[PDB]
A paper describes a structure:
Here, we report a δ-poly-L-ornithine synthetase from [name], which we name PosA. Nonribosomal peptide synthetase ([name]) enzymes, usually composed of condensation, adenylation, and thiolation domains, are involved in peptide natural product biosynthesis to produce antibiotics and siderophores. Activity analyses show that the [name] homolog activates L-Orn and the full-length protein produces isopeptide polymers in vitro. Structures of the isolated adenylation domain from PosA are presented with several diamino acids and biochemical assays identify important substrate binding residues.
To better understand the substrate binding in PosA, we solved four structures of the isolated adenylation domain. Substrates bind at the center of the core adenylation domain where residues mainly from subdomain I mediate binding. Glu221 showed charged interaction with terminal δ-amine of ornithine substrates or the ε-amino group of lysine indicating an important role in binding. The polar side chains of Thr304 and Ser313 were also found to be placed at hydrogen bonding distances of 2.9 and 2.6 Å from the terminal amine group of L-ornithine. The structures with substrates revealed Asp217, Met218, Glu221, Thr304, and Ser313 as interacting residues with the diamine substrates. Mutation of individual residues showed Asp217 and Glu221 were the most important residues for substrate activation since no enzymatic activity was observed in these mutants even at high protein or substrate concentration. Removal of the hydroxyl group from the side chains of Thr304 and Ser313 showed 33- and 183-fold reduction in catalytic efficiency in T304A and S313A mutants, respectively, indicating these residues are also important for binding. The enzyme assay with L-ornithine showed the highest activity while low activity was observed with DAB. This suggested L-ornithine was the most preferred substrate for the εPLs homolog from [name].
Author numbering: 6 to 411
């Protein structure tokens, strides 16, 4: 028996479906074809047209030899073409390796080499900056040429990678984090069952594809058919102008970090959902923003367990914590020798559930050191603990408390 020292999210086995990312998008495109998916300044793209164009690109990728399981790099400016190329890689059954706008070419080369990628997509302009990159470089423009014959795309499977994250800005040994199709489809359903992004929402898209939170901006939206407002690079660094733009554009969903939100001059009343990740929200910020017409959330979780692992509804005057695990996620605490600690003792925080990553690409050493068997799995989806390296304790209310690094 005995709970108290193992904390589980809500039980929702229906969030585990026999699906891949392409399935989620194709469903949305087929049921809402004329609905606007992407808007970039003045340009609008519907889900139907987005799906058709991404499909042309995926067929070109298949002609050039990319198959489910392959890894394709992605390096384009913020905007519609970037998301289209992401989706193109996805529809081909491959997984994409996203690169931030400011990734130096030599880092790109190092990461493509480490991932054993089959190539990457970039723009015409940026192709030149890639002389040092040995790997095959395809341009979006080239991949959107009219097709001669229909190129039948083979489907990937849940066990295959959906995307590989090389931590953006790392200068040390490349560490590729392999997120599977299963991981990310589960996450999308699990977190949205609480966030509740809906088709009629218009969601700000201000994150670089190299960051976890871009998924909450992008794929949560794809999940229900919401509209994305893609931020230009110029706006990303102007908080007062952003605060104004969100008003004028009637944005209903903001995913952001707390330091950005604190720099907003005034309230943005029309904001239905505010999802703060990356840092624990300060209390002054909650006091200012946890207003009645705002659903304000604080999400926590390492990249190694797909985007987020816990979430909390934050409330004026209630101390900010990391909240409860997302549905089907679980957290427990261990000691130096990988032993389950009693409730209240301080140890390393570990995460389990269907969204634990596959591991670190090509590094069985580190992977086995950080992804350990879960002696206490009450189910096959719980057999793998990820060791965050954070110290934590479970308090007398069944709540997890971070206490820094180990
Ligand atoms: N939903 C955001 C959680 C924190 C994020 N995975 C990060 O690594 O910053």
């Amino acid at each position: 028996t005995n709970t108290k020292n193992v904390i589980r999210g809500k039980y929702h086995p229906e969030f585990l479906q026999n699906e891949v990312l392409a399935d989620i998008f194709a469903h949305t495109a087929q049921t809402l074809p004329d609905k606007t998916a992407l808007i970039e300044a003045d340009k609008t793209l519907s889900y139907g047209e987005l799906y058709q164009q991404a499909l042309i690109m995926a067929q070109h990728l298949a002609l050039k030899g990319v198959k489910p399981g392959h890894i394709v790099g992605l390096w384009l400016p913020r905007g519609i073409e970037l998301l289209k190329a992401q989706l193109a890689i996805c529809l081909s059954g491959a997984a994409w390796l996203p690169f931030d706008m400011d990734t130096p070419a030599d880092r790109i080369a190092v990461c493509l080499e480490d991932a054993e990628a089959v190539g990457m997509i970039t723009t015409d302009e940026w192709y030149e900056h890639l002389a040092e990159v040995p790997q095959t470089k395809w341009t979006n423009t080239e991949l959107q040429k009219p097709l001669s014959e229909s190129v039948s795309l083979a489907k990937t499977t849940p066990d295959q990678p959906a995307y590989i994250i090389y931590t953006s800005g790392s200068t040390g040994k490349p560490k590729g984090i392999v997120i599977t199709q299963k991981n990310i489809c589960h996450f999308l359903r699990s977190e949205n069952s609480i966030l509740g992004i809906q088709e009629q929402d218009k969601v700000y898209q201000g994150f670089s594809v190299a960051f976890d939170m871009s998924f909450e901006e992008i794929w949560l939206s794809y999940l229900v058919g919401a509209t994305l407002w893609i931020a230009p690079k110029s706006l990303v660094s102007d908080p007062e102008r952003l605060c104004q733009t969100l008003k004028q554009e009637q944005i209903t969903v903001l995913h952001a970090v707390p330091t950005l939100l604190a720099l907003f001059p005034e309230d943005v009343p029309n904001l239905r959902i505010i999802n703060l990740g990356g840092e624990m929200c300060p209390d002054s910020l909650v006091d200012r923003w946890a207003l009645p017409h705002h659903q304000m959330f604080n999400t926590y979780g390492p990249t190694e367990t797909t985007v987020s692992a816990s979430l909390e509804l934050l409330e004026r005057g209630k101390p900010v914590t990391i909240g409860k695990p997302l549905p089907n996620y679980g957290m427990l605490v261990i000691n130096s020798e990988r032993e389950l600690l009693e409730q209240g003792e301080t140890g390393e925080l570990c995460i389990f559930g269907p969204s634990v990553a596959q591991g670190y690409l090509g590094r069985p050493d580190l992977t086995a050191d950080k992804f350990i068997e879960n002696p206490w799995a009450m189910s096959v989806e719980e057999e793998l603990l990820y060791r965050t390296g954070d110290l934590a304790k479970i308090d007398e209310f069944g709540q997890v408390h971070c206490l820094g690094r180990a």
